[model samples]
Target chain A: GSMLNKVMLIGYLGDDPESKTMTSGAEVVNFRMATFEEKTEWHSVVVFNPHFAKIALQYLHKGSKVYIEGKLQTRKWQDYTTEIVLPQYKGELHLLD
Target chain B: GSMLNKVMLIGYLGDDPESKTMTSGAEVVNFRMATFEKTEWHSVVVFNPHFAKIALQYLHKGSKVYIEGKLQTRKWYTTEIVLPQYKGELHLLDA
Candidate 1:
């Protein structure tokens, strides 16, 4: 049938957004989102998107409370002498007022 | 800058899938997923996709373990005496 891959969070920004441009001319931005839970103090979020990156730089700042909606994405990357992998995807958002 | 709205659950199917065909001929399927936790039962999920539906139909219920990758979604509809409404959207998958 139909399957959905989406996440919603109400949290604060953990840090400033980081950006990089791909060889293909696409922009990629990464940032950490912090969510507080009852038992756990924070849940770390990694967001990756070019368009959203620009938006964040313009509108989002550290410690700003926001509502985010997106998908989980995972990837594999090489560490110093090792390869580390993770799961999840990130997507756009409808910022809550 | 970027954001994510994804949820992953290892849970069991709560019910059989229900299907409907749209005027555009795309198939839609809906099912409820139940997850367990120490303090509480935790959460509910609604999966909407054609292929995932077929997979669910073949599933054996009650305590079956599955890994689901999906996003959170919300929607609102009209009440008997109300005229206002609300919104949300659901997307495809990889699980």
Candidate 2:
């Protein structure tokens, strides 16, 4: 009786990680990742895990390759927009050189 | 040197698999799957010929299954999980 919505991606960063601080003094990170399945597919990824965000901001930059494990979350922003979300302590992020 | 774009979902099917024949005579199947406690429905497609047949033959509304595929986005930001040949996987959870 287990349910899952896991997403695993190994791709290159499209730009340097962007950081923002919330009202509660929590840090979050956002970045764009691109994967090539013959054609380029760009994904919007958000990391809310403070520890993960710290590492992401420190080591991830434009064109850095890495692997991310998260879940798909869709929001209504003019149209249905799907983004990968790495929740606090619940997601995995690895820098793959 | 290879890249990966993989999605794994375990959920119940919303409806029976829909079967279609392409102009090249290849069979494909499409279906909606529900996942998570909040219940998000995802669009899924099977491009693996053999897998497509099994899906159409065995899966139905409310059937629980494990799905492995790659994410694809189309115009209008619509997204789908595509089960491509030699890469996609499916498993029935019936007991």
Candidate 3:
């Protein structure tokens, strides 16, 4: 894609990575990180690759520092009485201090 | 800060820019742009000075552009609590 849509952030995890599988049998892992804005701010990240998810879940934990770059996307879905917003991951990640 | 928080987008204008002056006398402008899979709107608090002023001036409802800046989660105190609602937006003073 010629047009760029990238997001980069370096922060610490808000919690340990949680891994799971879907009905379609696709594996996923949910990641959450909190960064500073004079205080703490949290971002919910969704990783789709099972390979990376396994590594991240095995090593990364709450308060672990990480730097990641990914395509920024928002998932809008109906949740019965309301809508949900999920910030997602669509690229590679790296560990940082 | 050492923590990286950056955003870079290259797309076309979804709408014309809207500029306003704050009560504190700072100039601010907003613009929306879109890419292949998604459309995003960015609020710029400062520009190259000339960069943003002319960027806005040159923009139409469907013009093309390239934007590079930092993604920010800003919270300011207005005399009450810490008020950590976490409103994130793209912000920059230069390209």
Candidate 4:
């Protein structure tokens, strides 16, 4: 945590927020966020805090503009994809819509 | 330019800065930046002549740095962050 690894992005939601509950009863929310540099860049954003996930799920929808700050994370699903991970109280969000 | 597509990162350089010259005689430099949150490698570019000059002069392989700039994309899913003239911020962290 001492070594810096932060990312800040402002983009539009490509789809509605999708959520899941872990065995520990923690909530998780994911969104396909889109930013444009001409051809539309899409990012996978995941939130792990229950309260933040709930708020995101309640307010975010397709095409909603928002700002988010989180750390870069990578996971493998047959292939490796880089993800933006928002941990408990570490992630920041602002609705720009 | 008003859509606020920015990114901030702190990491170590994987290699020394690489440079190129544009047809218009402008300077550009590239860095292979690595962040350990999940061990990711990112491509970062600098177009500011002054900044790039300082980076080329002071930065080396494995040098830690903090960078803030706007996100950009190249062909074939090569997503990159660009440090623009007068707008980007770079801080040397190895001091």
Ranking by DockQ: 2, 4, 3, 1
> Alpha-carbon error at A25 in model 3, in Å?
2.6
Backbone clash tally for model 1?
25
For candidate 1, the per-residue lDDT at A91 reads 57
Tell me which residue pairs clash in candidate 2: none
Worst 10 residues of 2 chain A by lDDT: A73-82
Candidate 1 lDDT over residue span B6-91, tens digit each: 35444455556455576756554554544432211212322334344544455434433334332222233110100011212222
Colliding pairs, model 3: none
Candidate No. with top DockQ: 2
B1-95: candidate 2 lDDT, tens digit per residue: 87889999999999999988888788889999999856788899999988888888889999999999998888767888999877799888973
What are the per-residue Cα lDDT tens digits for candidate 1 across A1-97? 2333344656676776566676867565555556433121233444455456667677777776666665333323565111010112445543443
Flag regions of model 2 displaced more than 4 Å: A21-26
CAPRI grade, predicted model 1: incorrect
Q: Comparing candidate 1 with candidate 2, which one achieves the higher TM-score?
A: 2
lDDT of 3 by residue, B1-95 (tens): 47755556667666787677757564555666666664644433333355546655676666766666544444441111011123223222223
Q: In model 3, where do residues sit more than 4 Å from their true spots?
A: A37-39, A79-90, B37-50, B73-95
Q: For each candidate, report its DockQ versus the true two-chain complex.
A: 0.08, 0.75, 0.35, 0.42
Docking tier of model 2: it is: medium
Instruction: Point out where model 4 deviates above 4 Å.
Output: A20-27, A36-40, A75-80, B22-25
Instruction: Compare candidates 2 and 3 on TM-score and give the better one.
Output: 2
The CAPRI class of candidate 4 is acceptable
Worst 10 residues of 4 chain A by lDDT: A73-82
lDDT against true structure, model 3: 0.57
Q: For model 4, what is the C-alpha lDDT against the true structure?
A: 0.80
